[PDB]
Write a protein that binds this ligand. Structure first.
Ligand SMILES: CCCCCCCCCCCCCCCCCC(=O)OC[C@H](CO[C@@H]1O[C@H](CO[C@H]2O[C@H](CO)[C@H](O)[C@H](O)[C@H]2O)[C@H](O)[C@H](O)[C@H]1O)OC(=O)CCCCCCCCCCCCCCCCC
Ligand code: CLA
Ligand code: CLA
Ligand code: CLA
Ligand SMILES: CCCCCCCCCCCCCCCCCC(=O)OC[C@H](CO[C@@H]1O[C@H](CO)[C@H](O)[C@H](O)[C@H]1O)OC(=O)CCCCCCCCCCCCCCCCC
Ligand SMILES: CCCCCCCCCCCCCCCCCC(=O)OC[C@H](CO[C@@H]1O[C@H](CO)[C@H](O)[C@H](O)[C@H]1O)OC(=O)CCCCCCCCCCCCCCCCC
Ligand SMILES: CCCCCCCCCCCCCCCCCC(=O)OC[C@H](CO[C@@H]1O[C@H](CO)[C@H](O)[C@H](O)[C@H]1O)OC(=O)CCCCCCCCCCCCCCCCC
Ligand SMILES: CCCCCCCCCCCCCCCCCC(=O)OC[C@H](CO[C@@H]1O[C@H](CO)[C@H](O)[C@H](O)[C@H]1O)OC(=O)CCCCCCCCCCCCCCCCC
Ligand SMILES: CCCCCCCCCCCCCCCC(=O)OC[C@H](COP(=O)(O)OC[C@@H](O)CO)OC(=O)CCCCCCCCCCCCCCC
Ligand SMILES: CC1=C(/C=C/C(C)=C/C=C/C(C)=C/C=C/C=C(C)/C=C/C=C(C)/C=C/C2=C(C)CCCC2(C)C)C(C)(C)CCC1
Ligand SMILES: CC1=C(/C=C/C(C)=C/C=C/C(C)=C/C=C/C=C(C)/C=C/C=C(C)/C=C/C2=C(C)CCCC2(C)C)C(C)(C)CCC1
Ligand code: OEX
Ligand SMILES: [Fe+2]
Lengths: 341, 75, 37, 28, 66, 38, 34, 172, 42, 484, 30, 42
């Protein structure tokens, strides 16, 4: 009837890719985060920001290419193309590291626009919105690492660059400087990721091994029409199996599939709380009862004090080349070496 | 129209037998004519270091960062 | 009135036409592709 | 029409692969 | 269903329930306010970020009067 | 007083969800104790 | 009309000429440490 | 070491001496458990989304499943039409058997491949090494992200077992 | 030297929430024994 | 038959007990703030507000009382140090005891509002079922918050009828509660301008007064009443949470980066005052002007206050603490006593060597002595065998200036190495680590803890926006979906 | 004195594992 | 100087027996609501 109704009926039309209202936020912003990454890893260097090479023009393969974080002198500037740093020039915008905030900002509005996509399709199909709530897990890892972690730090420079090996140094930068593995929020996150991979490997292998005979063929994939009301696997058998192997087992398909949602997602929320606590440098660095004892008793050694000496090697050896803006000129005689290494 | 009925048709490969080589070679000429080093400011292998500047160039200012990169890219 | 303030309002106008040319093109095509009752 | 949906993703992809094959033959 | 003396005063404030303005109403007036408040939040963030420089406005610890 | 509330409900917790919630507390007690004792 | 398996054959060996070209330039040109 | 801090002594020393992160079999099992926790929470949400009304709003959602029943407890056509619009139509498994097989394939193949990464790195066939790989025409080494990753490996290598070594190369 | 307020953190972090979850189970079984009407309802 | 995570949904269709519950959360919040502030006055020690301020003693809610104009206490001490004969009612003890009395009365009112749940006010006069007119309830409750915003900025802040805001100078030396006149220009959006806070709550209070005048009279459209589900009460909760974590990123933001509403005399310095050398450059600037006015060097450093050098110290950085270490910052290394002075390192050649300072990342950092141009001149070597820059070779002597070591010179390598290690930690202080059993590792300021809670809270409330929000829109299908 | 708490948490965790396996609410059809 | 095992004596001497006596009251009211058969038995 009205003008709003014609636009509402056009976006929600059955077509190849469902656009909806949320596609106006997703499809422009996701196309430019992805294309900003493919351009930045192919053409744009890191020679002026980090003093590296992170492009395909500079000989890096898929692994050692990245879209890199800007300089520490930029601080937390948004680095707009028209801004006071770039001033409209495209070429000087790329050399300062403007594509990285271009990827991260238009990417953050892609994950907004993709989670709104999951509320919109669920309302048209008419189902409960648990996909949009389980996808809030990965939103809490993008925001609290690519956004909330460099905000608490000195600049955008201490953020993960969007490249394969550039994530890998961020894994190593976070052990030596922060002792991230000791943090109980990672420990509750590893329990959800390795726990979530566990549940789909079991529920994959128990459904597929309690199937009913619905055909004479040896292939069991053929014997399932999608619109049938009979269940395709014996729940009573699978309960009787695991009650004797493992001792305790699900007797509820509604509780089972909810539990496959809770376990992976909670590991992304609990691990997201800790990385917000490392923006503020509130790290779980030491057990002081272990540290006061190892100072007074020069014979008491645990595995825990062995990890601190591994972190002095990370804090001293890479920090010269890690942070060229700070100009660490270490002598050879201050770098902690071991015996004969 | 189904997708597999498109690519098996001849009229599809009539059009895209011209457009694919005319677009792949334009991606070749975008590099071999040295154009990609000037749009994105990526250093050529000749020009990581210069005769004067023998260190690693860094930006060291918030607001005159455009002017400092005008310095480090002339020589 | 500064360099930074004049460039920002120009981006705000440029942010209006990006929303604009998407919106103007979307109203016109929504007239032609209406669904039969 | 879906010619704008695919070719927004495929016309760039062949253009960048025209550049990635050219960078294999570039040396110092 | 217990009449109290304070309940008698506030009763016309709750006596309406679910009356609507028919049509689109004041919705286009609201969006012009929401478009305006979106521009307001962008501006005061960019002042704070030093990505929008205003003359005689410096984002630094200033001498409050003692 | 006034009348009885028609919104009275009952709370349930089966034997299954007891052992989840017990094990949830003890494993969080195992995990976070070492940091609290410091 | 073209048989579909001919299409996946010609495009499939075209990818091998693209991939093995990329593993070629790991040992020559830039990024080869020569 | 059978412990918790002993595990991270094991992982870091294994990084300096073998470079596991660049090895493509740790790469094929990070994809196994990131993918595994994806398809876990992606399958577990689409079942819980499309549950059929069998309870009231006062009692629990889970009590609409009686144990050993023969009726299907969720509209599988509903969750197929949702994911058939969330990405596109042809990327959705209508077959629930082939769906519940892909949940068992992806992690298990990812951990078979990974556990034969530790095995092939037990015999000192390490991961990739792209240190000093990018040079200018003059021949000076241009750093990459692998060179920054190398300086993290050199810090752990010169500090692990700080008294056990006597000779310049950790052969063990 | 350990913090002596951590004993109160842990042993009340165990007992107070775990004794809570026991109570929701005991009154659950009492309502089921309450309706059932035999030998235990009273 | 409710699960344990749905026990508090019996209050959905009961407005009379919706208040008694919301009064009981209020009686616990107010009883916390009273009993927290009573706990802090038993712990606070006003012996030296220069080297032991309230932000060293872990005072959390106490910088929120002194921010809005409370300096005196019934003991007679003050945070400004000036003595008082009588603070009257509103002191630290008067506020703490009045948030308790308010808690006891919101407790008793919630017993009333729970028992007498059946009031005619909450019934619908057209159907009889318990209903809340959520558009006009929003008009009333927004008009009230327009008055309390405009009333705060015009009277409490500007000092018309109030004390005003704690203001300070640029470098945290002088600070006092005073009325603040509003700054209406573009300078009001400078967040370090305290006049912008007065101009905000006056301006935005008026907008909140006359939005309640709008949202009382004008009823919602038919479209927006159905689209935003304004008959349901959970669309209030879905969108109130969105207005609450959004507020919590802002306050955790402006606590962490600093604002005029977060003075560094109450919460402590930010980390960006250590990274940029905000106090190192200032202490030198008050010496560059002193030496230029014909002075000896030790008389120039003696003019520097002990408070100004106390901010130039890495133990006051909030980015140095840890998470599971607990207590005040005085548990870190002890209560500070005096300033040991400013050591100046000179070699046998006589040039000036500055100790390279520890960044906030590094827990451990090698002691490095650098001259004016960046050349490494001396250090303390890890490997003592092949040593080429040791202090024994270079012959670095230390000279103090100001503090209690005012004119002294230590020349041997045992003593110079002891002062070279403690000079990378900012300034050099004498502490008292035996009073609180100070173990020897740095803690965090209340600036650091406030940013921790209210930014981990706001991330959790983002999940509550998606839960309670998707529960509002999808309300007809939460028993399940129909198979037809 | 400190390790006594850690031991009580560990064997206390193994108690509720024992009761969950053997005293489980046995599910029944009909 | 006080004994630091007295905090564990008092605060568990309060809470553990007092939380016990709450449980015997909650299951008492659940059995009474269990037999009564209206709106709360389930
Ligand atoms: C949930 C779902 C979310 C959905 C995703 C939405 C994604 C949208 C993207 C958000 C855009 C945010 C980036 C804005 C840039 C940024 O932040 O920019 C940062 C600026 C602050 O600027 C920094 O301010 C600092 C403070 O300096 C001040 O202090 C110094 C010493 O005192 C000096 O005096 C200096 O002169 C003076 O300016 C330093 O100057 C830094 O160099 C400067 O970059 O703030 C600002 O723009 C705004 C900060 C105030 C708002 C606070 C909220 C945002 C921050 C949240 C994180 C708080 C940190 C908690 C960590 C966890
Ligand atoms: C403004 C705050 C607010 C309010 C008023 C509500 C209100 C409600 N929520 Mg909601 N929620 C919120 C925030 C809020 N929520 C946030 C931030 C999240 C994300 C974590 C959620 C996630 C959420 C879910 C997932 C669910 C609800 C549900 C409910 C309903 C019943 C609550 C219940 O039974 O819990 C009863 C809780 C208990 C008996 C014990 C909980 C014990 C907690 C976990 C630890 C102890 C709390 C601790 C002392 C609090 C410290 C204070 C801290 C908040 C600062 C009710 C309408 C339920 C619902 O939809 O109703 C059908 C439901 O399933 N909420
Ligand atoms: C006379 C005019 C006047 C003046 C001088 C001020 C002055 C001020 N206003 Mg105010 N205001 C006014 C009128 C005025 N107001 C009116 C009429 C309204 C309408 C009612 C408002 C509404 C308003 C709001 C809503 C806010 C202000 C704020 C401010 C402060 C700006 C400086 C600052 O710290 O912001 C810092 C700037 C921001 C915090 C930008 C907000 C953008 C958010 C944070 C983006 C991120 C959102 C996202 C959910 C976070 C998670 C993402 C994460 C990954 C980063 C300052 C006190 C801000 C304030 O109180 O902060 C202390 C603020 O948030 N004003
Ligand atoms: C009778 C009124 C009254 C007064 C005068 C005080 C006074 C005080 N309280 Mg208290 N309090 C009260 C009631 C009161 N309390 C009640 C009823 C409760 C229970 C809820 C509390 C709970 C409480 C706590 C928990 C704390 C205090 C604290 C304080 C002290 C500092 C206040 C402060 O910094 O808040 C700052 C207040 C704010 C930042 C509120 C901001 C409001 C947000 C931004 C509104 C935004 C939404 C808005 C409505 C949108 C519409 C805007 C529209 C105009 C356009 C101060 C002495 C603090 C203290 O030191 O305790 C000893 C403290 O931590 N109070
Ligand atoms: C029809 C629509 C088609 C849609 C296209 C959608 C776009 C998405 C495509 C994403 C591709 C991202 C991979 C980039 C790899 C790249 O180009 O490397 C191209 C690089 C370029 O190769 C490098 O070239 C340099 C030139 O200086 C040097 O010579 C290096 O030595 C040489 O390695 O090649 C590699 O690094 C070799 C290995 C390639 C490995 C790629 C596969 C790795 C797994 C990723 C799988 C992604 C899945 C995509 C699925 C689609
Ligand atoms: C029901 C359960 C009841 C128990 C609650 C269990 C909670 C346990 C965790 C809190 C206790 C751990 C504190 C360490 C114990 C210790 O001795 O500390 C003791 C310290 C006090 O420290 C003592 O202080 C004394 C003078 O004050 C002396 O100085 C002592 O030397 C000093 O040790 O107490 C605390 O630090 C309590 C802090 C509790 C408040 C937490 C603030 C941080 C909250 C941030 C919220 C973020 C949450 C986001 C969501 C995640
Ligand atoms: C109209 C709306 C006006 C805004 C709402 C009313 C203001 C509420 C804001 C909170 C109260 C202000 C904080 C308490 C002030 C306080 O400490 O008082 C104390 C001060 C005087 O306090 C004196 O202060 C001295 C210096 O500190 C010493 O401390 C003395 O000991 C102390 O007695 O008194 C006033 O400020 C009282 C005025 C506060 C407003 C009174 C209530 C107004 C209620 C009117 C609304 C009802 C009418 C509406 C029509 C129906
Ligand atoms: C359920 C409730 C669970 C709590 C139980 C509450 C009981 C509280 C009373 C016992 C605790 C009080 C002990 C003081 C606390 C303290 O720190 O002590 C701490 C002392 C241990 O003492 C510590 O020992 C350490 C090395 O052993 C170090 O030396 C410490 O310095 C030293 O203090 O613990 C006890 O003494 C516990 C004794 C408990 C056994 C009681 C024996 C006497 C019983 C006689 C029974 C007669 C009853 C007749 C009926 C009447
Ligand atoms: C030699 C081998 C013999 C078998 C060894 C036995 C060990 C088995 C472990 C018992 C699990 C008990 C947890 C109770 C859990 C409980 O009782 O759940 C009972 C639950 C049954 O659910 P139903 O379908 O009955 O529930 C339907 C509804 O009522 C839901 O409330 O079973 C499961 O879901 C358990 C599956 C995950 C199993 C979780 C195990 C996690 C591993 C243990 C982690 C702790 C180890 C800590 C050590 C420090
Ligand atoms: C940045 C930017 C921009 C742009 C954007 C865009 C437009 C982009 C796009 C782009 C794109 C979108 C890109 C793409 C790329 C692609 C590629 C380059 C691909 C490749 C591939 C490959 C290489 C793969 C491989 C393979 C194969 C082939 C088969 C088998 C398998 C495998 C996987 C191995 C703009 C203008 C806005 C401006 C601003 C900035
Ligand atoms: C009756 C009455 C009265 C009284 C009152 C009182 C005395 C009050 C008190 C009150 C109180 C005194 C209260 C308190 C409260 C508190 C609270 C409520 C708290 C809680 C907290 C929480 C629970 C938290 C938690 C946590 C933790 C612990 C850790 C970390 C995390 C968190 C934060 C979560 C009077 C006489 C006046 C009047 C008449 C009547
Ligand atoms: O033992 Mn255990 O860690 Ca395998 O590397 Mn050689 O050995 Mn000893 O050093 Mn390094
Ligand atoms: Fe399944």
């Amino acid at each position: 009837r009205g003008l709003f109704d014609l636009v509402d009926d056009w976006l929600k039309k059955d077509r190849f890719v469902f656009v909806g209202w949320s596609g106006l936020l997703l499809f422009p912003t996701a196309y430019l985060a992805a294309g900003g990454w493919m351009t930045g890893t192919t053409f744009v260097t890191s020679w002026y920001t980090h003093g590296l090479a992170s492009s395909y023009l500079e000989g890096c393969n898929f692994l050692t290419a990245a879209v890199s974080t800007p300089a520490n002198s930029v601080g937390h500037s948004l680095l707009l193309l028209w801004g006071p740093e770039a001033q409209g020039d495209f070429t000087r915008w790329c050399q300062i590291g403007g594509l990285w905030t271009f990827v991260a900002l238009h990417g953050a509005f892609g994950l907004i626009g993709f989670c709104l996509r999951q509320f919109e399709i669920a309302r048209l199909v008419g189902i409960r919105p648990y996909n949009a709530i389980a996808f809030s897990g990965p939103i809490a890892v993008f925001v609290s690492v690519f956004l909330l972690y460099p905000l608490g730090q000195a600049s955008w420079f201490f953020a993960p660059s969007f490249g394969v090996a550039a994530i890998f140094r961020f894994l190593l930068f976070l052990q030596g400087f922060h002792n991230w593995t000791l943090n109980p929020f990672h420990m509750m996150g590893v329990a959800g990721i390795l726990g979530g991979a566990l549940l789909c490997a079991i529920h994959g292998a128990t459904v597929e091994n309690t199937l009913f005979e619905d055909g004479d063929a040896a292939n069991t994939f053929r014997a399932f029409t999608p619109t049938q009301s009979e269940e395709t696997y014996s729940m009573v058998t699978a309960n009787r199996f695991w009650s004797q192997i493992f001792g305790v087992a699900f007797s509820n398909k509604r509780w089972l599939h909810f539990f496959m949602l809770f376990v992976p997602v909670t590991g992304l929320w609990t691990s997201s709380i800790g990385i917000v606590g490392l923006a503020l440098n509130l790290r779980a660095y030491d057990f002081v009862s272990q540290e006061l004892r190892a100072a007074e008793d020069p014979e008491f050694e645990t595995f825990y004090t062995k990890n601190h000496l591994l972190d002095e090697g990370i804090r001293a050896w890479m920090a010269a080349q890690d942070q060229p803006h700070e100009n660490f000129v270490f002598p050879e005689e201050v770098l902690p070496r071991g015996n004969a290494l | 129209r189904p997708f597999s009925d498109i690519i098996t048709s001849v009229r599809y490969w009539i059009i895209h037998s011209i457009t694919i080589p005319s677009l792949f070679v334009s991606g070749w000429l975008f590099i071999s004519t040295g154009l990609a080093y000037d749009v994105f400011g990526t250093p050529r292998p000749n020009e990581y270091f210069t005769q004067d500047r023998q260190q690693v160039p860094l930006v060291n200012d918030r607001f005159s960062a455009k002017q400092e990169l005008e310095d480090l890219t002339k020589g | 009135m500064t360099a930074s303030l004049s460039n920002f309002i120009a981006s705000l106008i440029a942010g209006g036409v990006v929303v604009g040319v998407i919106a103007i093109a979307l109203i016109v095509i929504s007239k032609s592709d209406r669904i039969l009752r | 029409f879906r010619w704008l949906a695919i070719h927004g993703l495929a016309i760039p992809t062949v253009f960048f692969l025209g550049g990635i094959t050219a960078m294999q033959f570039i040396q110092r | 269903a217990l009449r109290t003396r304070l309940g008698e005063i506030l009763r016309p404030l709750n006596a309406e329930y679910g009356k609507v303005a028919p049509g689109w109403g004041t919705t286009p007036i609201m969006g012009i306010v929401m478009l305006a408040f979106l521009i307001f939040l962008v501006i005061i963030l960019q002042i704070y970020n030093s990505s929008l420089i205003i003359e005689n406005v410096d984002v630094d610890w200033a001498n409050g009067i003692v | 007083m006034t009348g009885p509330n028609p919104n009275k409900q009952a709370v349930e917790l089966n034997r299954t969800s007891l052992y989840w919630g017990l094990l949830l507390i003890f494993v969080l007690a195992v995990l976070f104790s070492s940091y609290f004792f410091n | 009309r073209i048989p579909l398996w001919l299409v996946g054959l010609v495009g499939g060996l075209a990818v091998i000429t693209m991939l093995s070209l990329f593993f070629y330039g790991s040992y020559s040109g830039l990024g080869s440490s020569l | 070491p059978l412990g918790i801090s002993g595990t991270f002594n094991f992982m870091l020393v294994f990084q300096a001496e073998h470079n596991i992160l660049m090895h493509p079999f740790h790469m094929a099992g990070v994809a196994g458990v990131f993918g595994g926790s994806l398809f876990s929470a992606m399958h577990g949400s689409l079942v819980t989304s499309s549950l059929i009304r069998e309870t009231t709003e006062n009692e629990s959602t889970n009590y609409g499943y009686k144990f050993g029943q023969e009726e299907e407890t969720y509209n599988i056509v509903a969750a197929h039409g949702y994911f058939g619009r969330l990405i596109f139509q042809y990327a959705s498994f209508n077959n629930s058997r082939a769906l519940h097989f892909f949940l068992a394939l992806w992690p298990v193949v990812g951990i078979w491949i990974t556990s034969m990464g530790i095995s092939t790195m037990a015999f000192n066939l390490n991961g990739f090494n792209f240190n000093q790989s990018v040079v200018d025409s003059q021949g000076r080494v241009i750093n990459t992200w692998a060179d920054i990753l190398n300086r993290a490996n050199l810090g752990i290598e010169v500090m692990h077992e700080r008294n056990a070594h006597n000779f310049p190369l950790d052969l063990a | 030297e350990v913090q002596f307020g951590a004993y109160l953190a842990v042993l009340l972090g165990t007992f107070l929430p775990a004794l809570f979850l026991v109570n929701l189970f005991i009154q659950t079984e009492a309502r089921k024994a309450g309706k059932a009407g035999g030998q235990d309802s009273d | 038959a409710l699960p344990w995570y749905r026990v508090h949904t019996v209050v959905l269709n009961d407005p009379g007990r919706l208040i008694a519950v919301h009064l009981m959360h209020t009686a616990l919040v107010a009883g916390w703030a009273g009993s927290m502030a009573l706990y802090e006055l038993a712990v606070f020690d006003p012996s030296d507000p220069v080297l032991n301020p309230m932000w060293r003693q872990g005072m959390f809610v106490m910088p929120f009382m002194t921010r809005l104009g409370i300096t005196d206490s019934w003991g007679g001490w003050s945070i400004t140090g000036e003595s008082v004969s009588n603070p009257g009612i509103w002191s630290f003890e008067g506020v703490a005891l009045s948030h308790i009395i308010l808690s006891g009365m919101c407790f008793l009112a919630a017993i009333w509002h729970w028992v007498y749940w059946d009031l005619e006010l909450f019934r619908d006069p057209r159907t009889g079922e318990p209903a809340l007119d959520l558009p006009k309830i929003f008009g009333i409750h927004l008009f009230l918050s327009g008055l309390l915003c405009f009333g705060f900025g015009a009277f409490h802040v500007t000092g018309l009828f109030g004390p005003g805001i704690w203001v300070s100078d640029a470098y945290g030396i002088t600070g006092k509660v005073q009325p603040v006149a509003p700054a209406w220009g573009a300078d009001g959006f400078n967040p370090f301008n305290p006049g912008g806070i007065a101009a905000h709550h006056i301006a935005a209070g008026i907008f909140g007064i006359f939005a309640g005048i709008f949202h009382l009279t004008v009823r919602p459209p038919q479209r927006l009443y159905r689209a935003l589900r304004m008959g349901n009460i959970e669309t209030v909760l879905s969108s109130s949470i969105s207005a609450v974590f959004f507020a919590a990123f802002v306050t955790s933001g402006t606590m962490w980066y600093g604002a005029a509403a977060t003075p560094i005399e109450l919460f402590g310095p930010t980390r960006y005052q250590w990274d940029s050398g905000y106090f190192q450059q200032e202490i030198e600037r008050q010496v560059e002007t002193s030496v230029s006015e014909g002075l000896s060097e030790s008389q120039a450093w003696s003019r520097i206050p002990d408070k100004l050098a106390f901010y130039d110290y890495i133990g006051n950085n909030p980015a140095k603490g840890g998470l599971f270490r607990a207590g005040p910052m005085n548990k870190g290394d002890g209560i500070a006593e005096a300033w040991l002075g400013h050591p100046i390192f000179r070699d046998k050649e006589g040039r000036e060597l500055t100790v390279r300072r520890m960044p906030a990342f590094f827990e451990t950092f090698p002691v490095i002595l650098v001259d004016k141009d960046g050349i490494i001149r001396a250090d303390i070597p890890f490997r003592r065998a092949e040593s080429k820059y040791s202090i024994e070779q270079v012959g670095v002597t230390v000279d103090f200036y100001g503090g209690k070591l005012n004119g002294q010179t230590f020349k041997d390598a045992p003593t110079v190495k002891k002062f070279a290690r403690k000079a990378q930690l900012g300034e050099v202080f004498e502490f008292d680590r035996t009073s609180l059993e100070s173990d020897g590792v740095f803690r965090s300021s209340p600036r650091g803890w406030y940013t921790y809670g209210h930014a981990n809270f706001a991330l959790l409330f983002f999940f509550g926006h998606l839960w309670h929000g998707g529960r509002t829109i999808f309300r007809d299908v939460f028993t399940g979906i129909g198979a037809e | 004195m400190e390790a006594l708490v850690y031991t009580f948490l560990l064997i206390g965790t193994l108690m509720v594992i024992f009761f969950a396996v053997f005293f489980r609410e046995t599910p029944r059809i009909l």
